[PDB]
Design a protein around this ligand. Structure first.
Ligand SMILES: [Cl-]
Ligand SMILES: [Cl-]
Lengths: 217, 217
C-alpha cells in the first residue's frame, strides 16, 4: 500500500483520505497526535522527502508532499485530471478556488481575536457560497457527472464551515444537495461510519476555532 | 491573442507575467490601479468567468482564474508539466511549496501587527531557505536543466523576501546564483528592463510591508 502521514486532524488531509477511500485504493497512514510534534521533527528529514512537510505520501514509485499534489497524483493514475490542456486547467482552477474556500476558514479560525472578527467572515460568506452555487448549476458534481478530487476538497470545506455557521447552507440547497450526494456515495458513507474516520478536530488543536479536543454544539 | 487582468502590483501575477515573457507568448493585461476596486467589482461578474477572481486569463479557447491554474495552462500548451504521473506530481509539489514560500511572506506582510510578528518569521526563514537550497542541489533549475513555471514562482518569492531580509541569501549561494540565472535569461532581462515591468508594490498597496504607492526600500 501507499504510506501517508499527517497530524491526527482533518485539515488538509481529509480530502486525500476521502479520495483514496472513494477509489478503493489501499493505504496506511501514520497519525501524529497532539504531543508528537518532536517525533515528526525527527522523521521529517529521514523519509527521503525532497521538500519535507505534512502531509506526505510515500510508495515504491513516488515520494510526495503538498496535499493537492498528492490528490493529483492519485487522480492522475486513474485518468481523472482532464484530457485536454483546457480541461486540466479548469480542474486546476476549481482546485485552487477550493483551497481558497478551505484557507479562508483557516485564517478566521487562527485569529488571536477570533470572537471579534467572525462577524465579518460570516458576512462575506454568503457571497462566496453564492459563487460556488452558481458554478455548480444543475450538475451533480463540480466537473460534470463523475466525482473528482476537487469535489472532496469542496465537500470538506463546506462540512467544516458549517460548524461555525450551521445554517449557512439553508440559502444554498444545491450546495446542501451536493454535500449529501458526497456523503451518500457508498464508499464514502461506509468510511464516514468506520473506525478510521476522523471527525474532530477540523484544524490543528491550537486553533481558536475548529480545534480543541471536542466539537462545540 | 490572450487577455489577462490583475491589480497593478506584483502579487500572484508576476510569475505568470514572467512565464509569458519567457515563452514569448503574446498577451495584453488589464491593470486595476489602487483607485479601481469599484471598477473591478463592476467587471467581476461580467466576463463569463466561472469562478470570478483576480487574476484572470481569457482567450479564444479558454477562460480561467487562479494564478497557478493560469501558469499551468500556458505551460501545458508548451509540454512543460511532466511526461509521467510521478513527474507531474513532483512539479505539483514544488509548485505548492513555492506558493507556501510566497504566502508565508503574505501572512507576515498583511499582519495587523507587523513589526511584532516579523521576528518569528525572520527566525524561521533560514530553515525554509535551507530546504530550498538542499532541494536545488547542483541543478540550474528546480526541475532540471530547463526552466519551469515553478522557477518563476520561487524566483518571485525570493526577490520579494529580500526586501524584508536583505542578507537571507548570503548563507545560501546556490539560491543566490539561481536568482541571477533567471534575471540573466535573455527574454527575462529584457522585460525586466522594459516599461511593462511592475517593480513595486510586491503585495497589495494596503499591506503593512511590501506596500505603498512606490518604495525603493
Ligand atoms: Cl462510492
Ligand atoms: Cl531567455
Amino acid at each position: 500500500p501507499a504510506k501517508l502521514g499527517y497530524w491526527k486532524i482533518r485539515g488538509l488531509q481529509q480530502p486525500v483520505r476521502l479520495l483514496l477511500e472513494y477509489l478503493g485504493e489501499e493505504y496506511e497512514e501514520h497519525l501524529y497526535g497532539r504531543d508528537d510534534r518532536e517525533k515528526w521533527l525527527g522523521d521529517k528529514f529521514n523519509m527521503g522527502l525532497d521538500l519535507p512537510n505534512l502531509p506526505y505520501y510515500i510508495d515504491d514509485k513516488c515520494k510526495l508532499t503538498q496535499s493537492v499534489a498528492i490528490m493529483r497524483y492519485i487522480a492522475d493514475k486513474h485518468g481523472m485530471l482532464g484530457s485536454t490542456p483546457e480541461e486540466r486547467a479548469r480542474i486546476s482552477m476549481i482546485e485552487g478556488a477550493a483551497m481558497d474556500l478551505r484557507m479562508g476558514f483557516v485564517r478566521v479560525c487562527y485569529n488571536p481575536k477570533f470572537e471579534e472578527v467572525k462577524g465579518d467572515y460570516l458576512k462575506e460568506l454568503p457571497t462566496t457560497l453564492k459563487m460556488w452555487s452558481n458554478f455548480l448549476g444543475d450538475r451533480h458534481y463540480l466537473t460534470g457527472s463523475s466525482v473528482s478530487h476537487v469535489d472532496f476538497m469542496v465537500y470538506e470545506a463546506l462540512d467544516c464551515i458549517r460548524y461555525l455557521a450551521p445554517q449557512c447552507l439553508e440559502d444554498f440547497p444545491k450546495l446542501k444537495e451536493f454535500k449529501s450526494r458526497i456523503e451518500d456515495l457508498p464508499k464514502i458513507k461506509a468510511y464516514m461510519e468506520s473506525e478510521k474516520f476522523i471527525k474532530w478536530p477540523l484544524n490543528s488543536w491550537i486553533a481558536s476555532f475548529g480545534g480543541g479536543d471536542a466539537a462545540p454544539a
